Design a protein around this ligand. Structure first.
Ligand SMILES: C[C@@H](c1cccc2c(-c3cnn(C)c3)c(C(=O)O)[nH]c12)N1C[C@]2(C[C@@H](CN)C2)OC1=O
Ligand SMILES: [Zn+2]
Ligand SMILES: [Zn+2]
Length: 232
């Protein structure tokens, strides 16, 4: 009923959209992993009479449900998708997307890691993102590689028309008490990577984490704080 949808509010298999700004939505889905249920976010950005998708909905069936929810709520075709790192909450569902006419993209680093680990593999490589601080345009967004954080390949996405910063899993929600799933993280570099984001996007108005509630710029400092304390 208008609040940001939360883990116990979304059954696994269902997807909800949330309007962030004009032409910008997040998508929210839930999934089971190692016997616990988690929410996760992605992004939808209007690209003329088409849509750009950022990240899958964490699984094939969730991603099919995402496409159906987009058709119901927005009614414009998803033509391209970008996955912001190699984990299943970002690429699981890429095969569904490809079979539904969506061209799927990720950095070469993400594609290599997905392949090596047995995750679904985006079709197209995004060059120009291999060095921290790199940025490239992709339709209505800018893609930025901040350096290693949650993963070595994590990308962030900025929507300049709306000053929306989608941090993906390199950015944690304000209620977070831990650095999330750190299996593939670089806790030592993470605060430096967040500092790069802060420097590059000082006018961000909305910051969206990979999991949990959007907020403002304070999500970036909070993330640095909880990663440093985790490492400690
Ligand atoms: C799919 C994703 C994942 C699974 C379950 C929980 C989380 C969370 C999370 C947990 N708590 N909160 C608040 C968020 C985050 C996050 O932090 O992005 N990702 C998660 N995987 C799995 C993996 C690959 C490794 C294989 N050995 C383990 O690593 C990840 O990230
Ligand atoms: Zn991850
Ligand atoms: Zn994640």
């Amino acid at each position: 009923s208008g609040e940001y949808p939360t883990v116990n509010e979304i059954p696994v298999g269902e997807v909800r959209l949330y309007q962030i700004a004009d032409g910008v939505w997040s998508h929210i889905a839930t999934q089971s992993f190692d016997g616990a249920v988690y929410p996760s976010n992605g992004l939808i950005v209007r690209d003329g009479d088409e849509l750009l998708l950022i990240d899958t909905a964490w699984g094939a069936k969730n991603t099919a449900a995402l496409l159906a929810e987009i058709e119901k709520q927005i009614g414009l075709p998803v033509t391209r998708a970008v996955s912001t790192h190699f984990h299943d909450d970002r690429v699981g569902g890429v095969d569904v997307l490809r079979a539904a006419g969506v061209a799927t993209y990720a950095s070469p680093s993400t594609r290599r890691l997905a392949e090596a680990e047995g995750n679904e593999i985006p079709t197209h490589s995004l060059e120009g993102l291999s060095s921290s601080g790199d940025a490239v345009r992709f339709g209505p967004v800018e893609l930025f590689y901040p350096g290693a954080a949650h993963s070595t390949d994590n990308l962030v996405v900025y929507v300049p028309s709306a000053n929306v910063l989608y941090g993906g899993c390199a950015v944690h929600e304000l209620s977070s008490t831990s650095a999330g799933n750190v299996a593939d993280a670089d806790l030592a570099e993470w605060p430096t990577s967040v500092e790069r984001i802060q420097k590059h996007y000082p006018e961000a108005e909305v910051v969206i984490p990979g999991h949990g509630l959007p907020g403002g710029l304070d999500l970036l400092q909070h993330t640095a704080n909880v990663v440093k304390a985790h490492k400690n």
